[PDB]
Structures are given as C-alpha cells and as structure tokens.
C-alpha cells in the first residue's frame, strides 16, 4: 500500500492508524523486519538500526490509535517499505525519497546553460517537469537543462516530481546576473 515521497534533508510522517483499545502494541519495521521503534509496554523504545537518532513517534497520539514514525533528515537512502504493525492490523508504507540539485550555481550569467540533477533510489525514474518564472515548463529524467538563460528567468522557479499518483515540489530562485 502507501507511497510517500519524501525530500532530502526534510522530515517526514508515516501515519498509521488502528482501531484497537485507543493506544495498544505497535511498533515499525523496515524490510528486512529490522525493528525500528515500539512501545515497551508505556515508553518508546529505538532498536539499533541506521535510522535510530533520526526515527521518532509522537506518544500523545497513541491513545487515539496513531502511531506515527518520523524521520528527520531525510537521505534517499531512507527510501524504503516500512510495516506498521499494531497488535493484529499490518500495514505497509514505501518512502521514496528524492533530491533536486541546481549543478549550475543560481548566480549566473545570461546565455549561460543551468543544469539540475534529481537524485534519486536505486527503484524509481520519477518525471521532473520544471517551470522558469517566463512559463516555460522543462521536463526529463536525471538532468534537466536550460539552453541559455534570458534576464528574465531570474527568481524563484518551481520542480515538480511526481512518482506513483504522488509529487514533491522543489523550488528554486535562479539569479541570472546580466
């Protein structure tokens, strides 16, 4: 089920809801069943996994059968399908995580090419369609690429990302220096 795209170096909720007893045992794991973090009976408790001082949960929520898992500081390499497991429910998340580059320092000269690279997991070719403040969308796979950068392209530009049904926006402001 679920996909979440993420952004690199942002933060992120997977939610996970249940019925049960308004707070009950939960816990998150990744694929290879790596416990991430769950409920000692009362407390939250973080395994030893490469997400460990990253990987959080929100307790309040868990008397109304919440149980979140947040990831701060997002790598691409957080990408991955997490289960949530609350007592007898199972569900499944996939985080796809994505990062949008600008190769190209935003402070350049007119008629100067701007390249932007889109990382990305080793499991997704997501479609970047950028737009420069004139309207003209650009679109592609890894590398985006402008031709030649007219005065007035400088400011805030938009990347969009979109990955199964879903998207991210990146932004960026280009300062195309005369």
């Known amino acids: 089920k679920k996909v979440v795209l993420g952004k690199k170096g942002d933060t992120v909720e997977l939610t996970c809801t249940a019925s049960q007893k308004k707070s009950i045992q939960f816990h998150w794991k990744n694929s290879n069943q790596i416990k991430i973090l769950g409920n000692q009976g009362s407390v939250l408790t973080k395994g030893p996994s490469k997400l460990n001082?990253?990987?959080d949960s929100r307790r309040s929520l868990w008397d109304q059968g919440n149980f979140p898992l947040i990831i701060k500081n997002?790598?691409?390499?957080?990408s991955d399908t997490?289960?949530?497991?609350?007592e007898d429910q199972k569900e499944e998340v996939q985080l796809l995580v994505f990062g949008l580059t600008?190769?190209?320092?935003?402070?350049?000269?007119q008629g100067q090419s701007l390249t932007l690279t889109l990382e990305s997991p080793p499991g997704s070719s997501p479609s970047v369609q950028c737009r420069s403040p004139?309207?003209?969308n650009?679109?592609?796979?890894?590398?985006?690429?402008?031709?030649?950068?007219e005065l007035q392209d400088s400011?805030?530009?938009?990347?969009?990302?979109?990955?199964?049904?879903?998207?991210?926006?990146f932004k960026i402001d280009i300062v195309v220096l005369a």
């Open 82 to 86: 997490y289960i949530c497991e609350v």
């Open 102 to 109: 600008a190769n190209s320092d935003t402070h350049l000269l």
């Open 138 to 149: 650009i679109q592609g796979g890894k590398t985006l690429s402008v031709s030649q950068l």
């Open 74 to 78: 997002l790598k691409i390499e957080d």
């Open 53 to 55: 001082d990253r990987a």
């Open 155 to 169: 400011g805030t530009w938009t990347c969009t990302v979109l990955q199964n049904q879903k998207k991210v926006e």
């Open 134 to 136: 004139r309207g003209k």
